[PDB]
Design a protein around this ligand. Sequence first.
Ligand SMILES: NC(=O)CC[C@H](N)C(=O)O
Ligand SMILES: NC(=O)CC[C@H](N)C(=O)O
Ligand SMILES: NC(=O)CC[C@H](N)C(=O)O
Lengths: 531, 531, 531
Amino acid sequence: RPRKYVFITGGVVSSLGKGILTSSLGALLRARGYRVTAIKIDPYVNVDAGTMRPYEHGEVFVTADGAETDLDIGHYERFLDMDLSRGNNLTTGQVYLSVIQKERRGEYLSQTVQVIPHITDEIKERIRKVAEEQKAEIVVVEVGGTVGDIESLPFLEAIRQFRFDEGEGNTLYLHLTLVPYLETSEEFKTKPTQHSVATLRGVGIQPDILVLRSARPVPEEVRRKVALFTNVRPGHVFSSPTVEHLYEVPLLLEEQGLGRAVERALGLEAVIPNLSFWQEAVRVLKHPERTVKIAIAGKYVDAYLSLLEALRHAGIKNRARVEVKWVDAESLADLEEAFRDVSGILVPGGFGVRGIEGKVRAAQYARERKIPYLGICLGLQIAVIEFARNVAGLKGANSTEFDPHTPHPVIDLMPEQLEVGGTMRLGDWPMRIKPGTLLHRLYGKEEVLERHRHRYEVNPLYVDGLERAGLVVSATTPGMRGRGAGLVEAIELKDHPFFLGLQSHPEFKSRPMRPSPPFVGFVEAALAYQE
Amino acid sequence: RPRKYVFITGGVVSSLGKGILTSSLGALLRARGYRVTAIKIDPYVNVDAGTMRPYEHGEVFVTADGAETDLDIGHYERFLDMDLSRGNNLTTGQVYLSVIQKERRGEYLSQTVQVIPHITDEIKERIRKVAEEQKAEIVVVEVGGTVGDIESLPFLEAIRQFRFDEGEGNTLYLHLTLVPYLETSEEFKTKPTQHSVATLRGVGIQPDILVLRSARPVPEEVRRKVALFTNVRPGHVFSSPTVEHLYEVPLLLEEQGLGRAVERALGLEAVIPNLSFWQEAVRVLKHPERTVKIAIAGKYVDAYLSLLEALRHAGIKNRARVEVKWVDAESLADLEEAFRDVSGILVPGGFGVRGIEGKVRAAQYARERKIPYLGICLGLQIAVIEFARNVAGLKGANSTEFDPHTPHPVIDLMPEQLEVGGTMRLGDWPMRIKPGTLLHRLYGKEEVLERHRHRYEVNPLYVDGLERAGLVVSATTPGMRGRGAGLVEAIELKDHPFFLGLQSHPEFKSRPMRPSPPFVGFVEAALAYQE
Amino acid sequence: RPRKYVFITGGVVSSLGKGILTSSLGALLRARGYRVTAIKIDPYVNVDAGTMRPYEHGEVFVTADGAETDLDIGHYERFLDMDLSRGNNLTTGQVYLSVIQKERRGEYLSQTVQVIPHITDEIKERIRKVAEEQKAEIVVVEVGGTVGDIESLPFLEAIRQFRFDEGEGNTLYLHLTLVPYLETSEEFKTKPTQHSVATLRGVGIQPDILVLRSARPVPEEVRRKVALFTNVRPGHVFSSPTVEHLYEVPLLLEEQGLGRAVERALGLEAVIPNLSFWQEAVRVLKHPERTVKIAIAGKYVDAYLSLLEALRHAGIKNRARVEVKWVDAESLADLEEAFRDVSGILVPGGFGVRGIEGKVRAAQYARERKIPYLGICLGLQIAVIEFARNVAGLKGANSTEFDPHTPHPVIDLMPEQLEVGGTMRLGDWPMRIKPGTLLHRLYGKEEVLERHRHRYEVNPLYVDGLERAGLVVSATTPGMRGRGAGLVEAIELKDHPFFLGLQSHPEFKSRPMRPSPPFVGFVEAALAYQE
Ligand SMILES: NC(=O)CC[C@H](N)C(=O)O
Ligand SMILES: NC(=O)CC[C@H](N)C(=O)O
Ligand SMILES: NC(=O)CC[C@H](N)C(=O)O
């Protein structure tokens, strides 16, 4: 049974929702029982998303293996319901760096190294390597950038070569384009699509399937015209209309027949997908039994893409619509009005002093006014800082990240004793939950894994005291590779309806099919608070 | 002093308002005192617009010389304020037919005839010939179609050759493209523009000026990015935002600096344009002293492009906003409600029986209820028919176009005596107005020219009787080339506030700077009726 | 059983021998028993080759139906061994003229007519119409021009559309390109091929087969590289090396596997071609039993393409190599040296006085010195003129074409009595051969058809006298459609080893498989003369 490859390119304009299309096709294939994996090719020169801002210009996703990748990997994980790794985000920097380092070591045996075939071999090899490791039966590869630009050329060439390498029936090429619709003229402009496919053909790729992005679905007559001038059969031209909920996409594509078309094109026996989860999730999103509002007091108010997705997953499970009120951390200054008509307060992650003191106030206000509180990473550090100051009377308490000279570094770098150097804790780390805690009630397990991306920890030296003040350490980590043994992973308050914080980013693991308990509980408590 | 040529191409999509851009640049140049002319190249194979439907799929304009052309010629005439001719609408059919007929006659002297240079020579020759006849100092040529399609290729090549033929400083190339704007992302997508210009460059043309069509104006920073990747200097990239009134375009383009950029590029001494007319016309359109509503009882409710423009011109002169209520002729069946809140009824032109009887009812209703009435071409024939039936008691009266067997053909083909064969009366025909009539009051002249396009006339044999019944022949034509001597050109009613009809299409000559009197009076009477 | 279409395009440069490739594939298919036909698309604007010079810039072929076409039709007829017609030479002029005339007649029903789909529909319709009339099972269509130029675009689009129209397995696309070979570097440059195919793909066509034109055959390794970067399978990339004899082409292509590849691609059951004729003809050309030299006293010394082919066909049948000595008619002035080592003199066709008197001398010299003489069309008129002057003593005798005022118009326009106006006799005309003549000995029939293209005939009024002088009219035509009844078609001399002339162009019908008797005899007589 040969491995199947489905490549996805985009044309006309850079933004078409190609990430969600890839994810949606991934879901339709997994809904058929196939073992699938998606690879996001990002033509940029950055080796990885590690040197970029973690939130500001859009969230940087973190995989179980600790890789910092493009946010699309998160989409992919959510729609396919599986962990991806560093190998699922391929960049120009990675490819050129390996090939270049390889020829400096003389491993190319004195020959002249070139984009073709050397850079292109590296690209294909990485695509196959990761698909092998994940035992994929079908692999969906999304080419970032836009057909017609310079950066994606090496990648378009690389994937073009797969048809010959893999043999007939094992590769399929899909191209997504923009079809402008004039509300007045009431007409769909297909020329951009025509020119884009012609350009793609010029580099050597003939799409087998086309998806036309437009405000509304593209009429059959129009789709036929496009089919005939592109060399794509009529039944292989589909629409990608704009929709209210992202979860609707897999459904509308399957209904039009994308799934069937794909199976056939790959010469696979027809399998009836089970889309029961998506259908119900979309039903819940369109008809919530109730709706509650919570506030996100962040300093970056797609910076919290995974966070917002996590809230949505929890909402669905609670059969409730979760409305988000964005509260600018720094502005925190009438809290009564800022959190008016708010049944929950969430303090997300971030770096830098900006907004810290503002978040501190939100936490205090949420602790005193018995308002559900969820703190993620920095959110926990904030809570620890606010508790340290106003409950343990540790005046000036803070994190050395914000005040390197505070007299009470309740949050500081990795303790020298627990170190092995100046690197963050990234990826999955085991978390031992304490029985009888709120954390325990939510998970229902005593041992779990959550993903991390931070360089500051709760200072051990202060734990004993804070606990005496009434702070509960509902979770700790046994460490990993002899590092961070004993570090605090979660904190909560006993005399509060819902006050929880975690050092990790549990949003990163949240899947619409399997919500993150910390968020499930947060939403549940919110609803409770709303009475 | 060399003749200057400004070529205008379009890219990305077929609809960008390139016709109005051409017209607007034409206006800015005439506002500088230059003798200008515009040529519309229509890549279609039709020799002319003569075999197309006159109204249904958009109006077919008629020039003073009787040529049936694309509607853009009308725009051109209105913005430049000058009559154009058959030579101002160049088509593929015209070009290939002349070259082909020429080689069949052996006039190419036994050589192999080809698209290049023979078809391209014909195109350039026609462009120069018409510009010469019109003594143009600056000629604006608009290339129909979209860069990247097959049909316009011979024309793009033809105009590319002008740079070398005319010598430096005498040719300028402008390209209009679509820049999609995402209301959400709040971003302008410039890739389509980039790809389009790259394609244009590929055929051999480097634009000197670019105009970016988009919902809103394109920011300076964005325009600079486009300038740098297209080879067009920053100061030569302009915006074409969507606007309320067409007359605003010349103004916004001049303000941004298109006029100045053009003069400079053509090496002409700066001239301060006088845009006083446009500024006031736009002021009137934005702030009408009053507004009246009139109904258009037509069978095609851009079929009446020139008609609606004519109403707008009249409105401006009357400093009033004219609201049009579309009344489907055929549906005419409660007239009281159909013309409710209507201070004027206009019955436009058309061919075919469809809606005739419905129009007849509108006329009768407008004659009895003393409601201002304006009938254009068919509009007059309708009025004559309704008057014949209900005032002269000529039962069954009609036009032989609708009832070839009516016992009273008050409207029929060109009288055999007045003929010279089965062709329509097209283009300007002299009209002798009768002193003391409503027609006379409106024009203020006794002799004028109006454009025609019809094959039916008021049957002479019935004039005497109809006049006795009370119908007034306020105009007749002395004929032309010994044809149609004596034919009725206009009719009106003495005992009515405003009841007028003309055989010609006076909308075709209406200019915003010089409104058509028949419409000026119609609007004036409407206002009167509204009290 | 579906009709199969094989399209042939050319890239990089205009001259690649694509005409002979088309012809050669045609031969391989007919050698398999298929009914085939070839259509030559000539992108030029000339409706037909009728207004071009008949010889000067290359011969203009004439088909049985009297059509004047591109010389490729001749190749086609020779390799396929079948008569083609006007419909086998499609031009831009024909296509645009029909569509244009059609819309002027309003036959497009008021719609806007465009290159696509109207011009393209006309092209496809003409291709199918002619294939139907000829009951073709396989049709080979050659696209003139070069991929990448403007003129052939409408045709490339037209043929691209056939794949969808005809359904899978019924269309095949072949592209011929130039692969430069550096004699020094000893390398084949494949980039031109790469860029050309990329351009072809850009217009929407993916070649299934490629033929690389180069000085020498392209190595397998190189062919594989081209296959991989063009999307064409390795076994479908072939070579077209330069060769000594044109007849070698079908053979080398079949040997490489073009025939097999084509049958398979069209989903046809393998048929073993019988290439026995070509193999022997090539054997004869490489190893002639003998060789003789004849002189061609023409005024255009590919003007005589069909003539030279006819000589080659005759040579093969006589198992002798025929060497041609070009003798410039006008220069005729030492005949002894001009015809030194010449065993035969041929005077071909032409128009105009230039060289007439020179040809006259060659004829006289050939008649007196008992040297084999073959006169084609003008060649016969010359002989009649020379005989009239020097044997019948008709001083000043001539053709009115050269001397409108000669006192003895032994050759003049179509006799007024035999006319029906000022048109030439074109295409096949029946020729009644007289028993016992040299003409009869050669053909072996009394009635045959030969193709014509001339406007001058032997003046009847002079026949009687010339016959008395000793001239023999070995053939006459019963006329056609009541025209030219009785006209002289051939003349010969009784007291001469070989002196023959014909009014028609028997070269046009000569096929390598079936030589034209007049030439067979001419060569035979030449050999005889050489002793
Ligand atoms: N993303 C975050 O929440 C980071 C919190 C803090 N900067 C740390 O390094 O721990
Ligand atoms: N356009 C018109 O108004 C045409 C009216 C009528 N068909 C005529 O030929 O006179
Ligand atoms: N091609 C020819 O041989 C033409 C001969 C001569 N011009 C004729 O019209 O008969």
